[PDB]
Design a protein around this ligand. Sequence first.
Ligand code: HEC
Ligand code: HEM
Ligand code: HEM
Ligand SMILES: COc1c(O)c(C)c(C/C=C(/C)CC/C=C(\C)CC/C=C(\C)CC/C=C(\C)CC/C=C(\C)CCC=C(C)C)c(O)c1OC
Ligand code: FES
Lengths: 93, 93, 126, 61, 57, 385, 55, 62, 247, 49
Amino acid sequence: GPPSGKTYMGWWGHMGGPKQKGITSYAVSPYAQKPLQGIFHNAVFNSFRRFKSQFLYVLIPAGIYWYWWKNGNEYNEFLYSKAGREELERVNV
Amino acid sequence: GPPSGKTYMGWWGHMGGPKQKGITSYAVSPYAQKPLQGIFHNAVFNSFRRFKSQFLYVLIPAGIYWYWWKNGNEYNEFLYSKAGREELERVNV
Amino acid sequence: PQSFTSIARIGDYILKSPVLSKLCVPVANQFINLAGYKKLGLKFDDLIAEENPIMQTALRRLPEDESYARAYRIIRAHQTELTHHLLPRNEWIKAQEDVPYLLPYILEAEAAAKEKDELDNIEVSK
Amino acid sequence: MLGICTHLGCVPIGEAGDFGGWFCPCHGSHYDISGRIRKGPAPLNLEIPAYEFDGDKVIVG
Amino acid sequence: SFSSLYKTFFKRNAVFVGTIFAGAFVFQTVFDTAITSWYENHNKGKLWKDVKARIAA
Amino acid sequence: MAFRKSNVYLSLVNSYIIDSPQPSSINYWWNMGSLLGLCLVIQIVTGIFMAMHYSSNIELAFSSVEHIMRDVHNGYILRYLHANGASFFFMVMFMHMAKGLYYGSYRSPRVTLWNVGVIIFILTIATAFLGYCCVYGQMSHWGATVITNLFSAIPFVGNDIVSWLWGGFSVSNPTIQRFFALHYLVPFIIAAMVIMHLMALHIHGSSNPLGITGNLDRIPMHSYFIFKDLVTVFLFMLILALFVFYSPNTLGHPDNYIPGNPLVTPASIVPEWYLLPFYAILRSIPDKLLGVITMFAAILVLLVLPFTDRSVVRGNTFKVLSKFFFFIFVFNFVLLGQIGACHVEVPYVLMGQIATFIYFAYFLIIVPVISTIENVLFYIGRVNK
Amino acid sequence: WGGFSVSNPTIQRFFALHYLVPFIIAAMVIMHLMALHIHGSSNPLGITGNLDRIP
Amino acid sequence: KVEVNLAAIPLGKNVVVKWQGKPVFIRHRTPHEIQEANSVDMSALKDPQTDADRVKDPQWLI
Amino acid sequence: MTAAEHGLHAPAYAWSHNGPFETFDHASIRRGYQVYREVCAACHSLDRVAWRTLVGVSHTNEEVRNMAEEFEYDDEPDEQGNPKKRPGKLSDYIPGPYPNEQAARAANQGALPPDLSLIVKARHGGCDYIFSLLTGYPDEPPAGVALPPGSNYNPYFPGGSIAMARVLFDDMVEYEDGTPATTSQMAKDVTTFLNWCAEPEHDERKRLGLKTVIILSSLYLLSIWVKKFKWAGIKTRKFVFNPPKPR
Amino acid sequence: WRTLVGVSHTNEEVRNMAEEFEYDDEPDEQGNPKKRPGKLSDYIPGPYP
Ligand code: HEC
Ligand code: HEM
Ligand code: HEM
Ligand SMILES: COc1c(O)c(C)c(C/C=C(/C)CC/C=C(\C)CC/C=C(\C)CC/C=C(\C)CC/C=C(\C)CCC=C(C)C)c(O)c1OC
Ligand code: FES
């Protein structure tokens, strides 16, 4: 087969990142560790940290579109009742 | 991507044959030639040479299996005729 | 898949029996003439399948001048077959030129491979 | 019993020929009330299906 | 001239391809008409149109 | 580099049909592979357009095919193309497999490529059988009865497999709707196994008629074998058009224009012509279990070939005895089909039993014995000992 | 439609197409994975991932 | 196309039939109601449509 | 099996629609329908043939309208739900003589007359077998055979005994065009008509095959020249070997 | 009818319920229409034709 174009990822041994020097790494076998360690502590304190930093980006857009939907739904109920039959004539035609 | 195993074919420039030295080749452009040169001569004399060298390997097995087929067809027809009723009972029963 | 060591063992026994060498060889010469590879400019040793490890070492160890000639005969036959013709009768390989040039390099490579297998299954008489 | 010739499959003609049996016109063999083939290349006898009785009646199944 | 013939139809691929398409349009209509005409004439007296007019006499 | 080599999708096209290095010595027998690719495309496209007007209910299956011929515009062209195209599919495949048997294309470096082809052969036989049953004529109903009833010879579980296959107590409505759904799916499995066929060919490339290496002289695929394949492509459609417009029912059976009736046996029951050689092998064994096993053996013995060939030369081009006995096997195959379309008579029973023996003795006896004899003749014919 | 409104020709041909398109989808998923294998996937940090990889 | 005759329908009742996948009406007409359709509003309410093309058979309106 | 249970092979006649450039004789199709209606239709059906397919082939549009309007077809129920009947129209199918199969076997001594819409294509012999069967009833069965009661003899029927009796006799139909209606003339005309029933595309299929073969044969010849032109450089190619010096 | 057995009624009870209705049968040897009482494999009939 012929070679292909130049890419931005290689393989094991020539992955194509910068040259590394001066970094040491350590690790321990999982058979000598404790899985599930710290789940109860993380389930309350880590979850509160993550929730507090992101909930404003999600809730403010959600609350804006939910108020718009309820207000437009309540207006429709007013036009199709006996109380607002006069307004239904002008707005429609 | 990872490397693959060892094959017996390569690509252009590294095909994988013996080193070649001393062989020269010449060719002429097809735009300067006659494509239909010698068709009438080859259709008779070359065709006769090719046929004469292989026709004995095909016809002898064909004639053996055709003589076998015809001899078995005539025997079956004779067996189910009025003149073959004495043999049909002594074979099929 | 039949090894050349076995082929030569049967062949050499035939060629040393006066009776057996009298009827087998004349029918073997006609068999080779009807095969028709000499009419393309080829020797028998050029027709051996080469995609095995044994025949890859034999072709590696072949002397350089004999290896250049073999490449020309192989390229010549492909071009001749491409045209559906034969070579002119003066370019045919003759009987005295159809020699087993690659045979010694195959028998020696095969003997080395057989000895290796016998030594991986060695059993010391303890 | 099954209305199929015991050799290669056929259709029985109703009460025609032989010992008041039926007819297998595929080759020219006939039948009898007992279901016993009297002539032909039939290897065995006619097969009977499984069934039960409604006291005096007859079912199929 | 053969030089002018090459320069007009065979130098630009656009003209070469357009000429093939315009020659296939003309061939398509002419080939169909010439085939039915021969086919109908070879079977004169056996068509419904032939027998319909005969009984209309 | 060129855009045809750097692009992710074009590089697969370039490496397979443009820049592929081919030997310069391959003849027209190396053109059947590209023809089989065109056959598979023809069958898929005509089948899909016909499936828009087809009903698989057992009470409407026969009438829906008659509806296609009469009411659908150009519908008879689609049907005759699909029915005759399947006959030409097996013609090319038979010649495609005999080319590799003659030229030793099954030998060592390409055993995996040969094995995938045997799987494609099994699937194609099943696909053609399933589509024949979908017409629901007199030969398709009674052909399905005999074929599916042979599975009942399996010990213990045999009778339960037939009921699961039928969907009931005999060949009925559940069976016919079962077979149309499978007839739609299996061709897509073949198309996926054809890609695996080409992947195993690309590792070592094609072979050549001479049987020696082709690494010394190569030419690219494009503009040399693209136009040589176009020659047999045009010849292929010319012969197919002859059978579609001038003789569309020469390769069929007239009893398949009688609607399926489970109460009348259609006298002699035979399959299509391309399954006849394997039908005669099954009938030669006077035992249901043993006779059924021998029928799939006839397709599985093709895998024994790379190990019973004791020759140091690949192919039959320069072999005298191997050339003679090759055509004995070929015409033995033709005689087997003739017996399969015959009645069970006095001479024909023994004729098919001997011809069955020759079929199996070729792989297991003739090829090993002949190939060892020729090895010695090549040796003693030139060595001065 | 195959006719003058939604009718028997339409329903029978819509089932034939509903059988076919899923096999076209399976073919474009392979082309989807082929284009991913060139540079690999990305990461939530948005930067290069060539310095730390796991199989 | 449909082929239904008009010699089997009485006077003074609606008949609704399906053609081309859609329903249509048919009914005999009355003396002055059609003349009222001549006297009905021209273009002052919804649609400037005359009765010239609406009905071509003054005894059946389909 | 014996030749008696095989059935005698029909000979080969010179039909006018035999040949790659030949069509149906549409005058024999028109005559063949009259034979079917007056002789065949009493016991055989043509349920795969619609009335509209006869227009422009053997009859005018108005003629087929009057032919179909002589039969009664079921209609939609009325306002109260009672059943109704209506005369036929061009979109209907040719009706058969019996309401069900039990009625047919009751009127034919237990034998079932087959449908005749694909009978030409469903028999080995085609038009030559139908003609030979209709004109091959001997006045006497050969000395020795024993016919079951209610069955006739015909050498062309596999087995010999056939439940249909001879039905074609000279001057039993009066053709409108003045053709003398004999046993052979009527058997020839009704066979052409039945062949058109099985293959109504015969005329237009043969015209399309002429265009296809002419175009495809030209392309096969043109591709041979193009292949030889592109291969000219490789076909005429020369090699020379000069052995190198040892180094 | 067969779907009510073992759910709300007994086999012997559903059979009696079905036998009080009439269903089209196969034509007799002369080809005339026939009727028969219902079975467990039949469906519950409606009031209007
Ligand atoms: C008027 C011309 C006419 C034609 C043409 C015709 N029939 Fe038949 N036909 C039958 C019966 C019954 C069979 C079945 C014969 C059998 O199965 O043995 C049959 C069989 C056939 C067959 C099948 C032959 C075969 O090989 O199976 C053909 C074809 C046929 N008829 C055509 C009753 C009739 C009757 C009633 C007397 C008439 C009239 C009749 N047929 C008139 C005709
Ligand atoms: C739809 C079915 C098939 C298709 C599309 C197909 C396609 C191809 C193609 C394109 C080639 C290369 C071109 C050529 O050699 O002509 C090839 C080669 C080959 N095929 Fe197939 N094939 C199919 C079935 C089979 C079968 C059934 C077998 C064997 C049982 C088989 C065995 C081989 C072998 C051995 C080769 C290599 C031969 C050689 O190059 O010398 N194939 N195939
Ligand atoms: C390799 C691919 C295929 C093969 C070999 C094949 C083979 C066959 C054969 C032999 C028949 C019998 C036709 C006859 O005898 O008249 C048939 C019928 C049929 N096939 Fe296929 N088939 C293939 C693919 C398909 C596909 C993909 C479809 C649908 C998507 C399809 C739909 C049908 C239908 C609807 C029939 C109905 C009978 C008819 O129209 O003749 N086929 N097929
Ligand atoms: C010469 O070089 C070649 C070579 O070029 C080729 C192609 C092949 C063949 C190789 C293959 C792998 C075969 C390729 C084909 C397949 C795997 C299967 C083909 C698949 C199909 C035809 C499916 C396509 C189906 C459709 C488009 C459905 C049609 C229906 C439509 C359009 C419905 C209409 C649409 C609407 C909206 C109503 C060779 O072997 C070969 O030699 C090396
Ligand atoms: S099938 Fe009835 S006797 Fe053989």
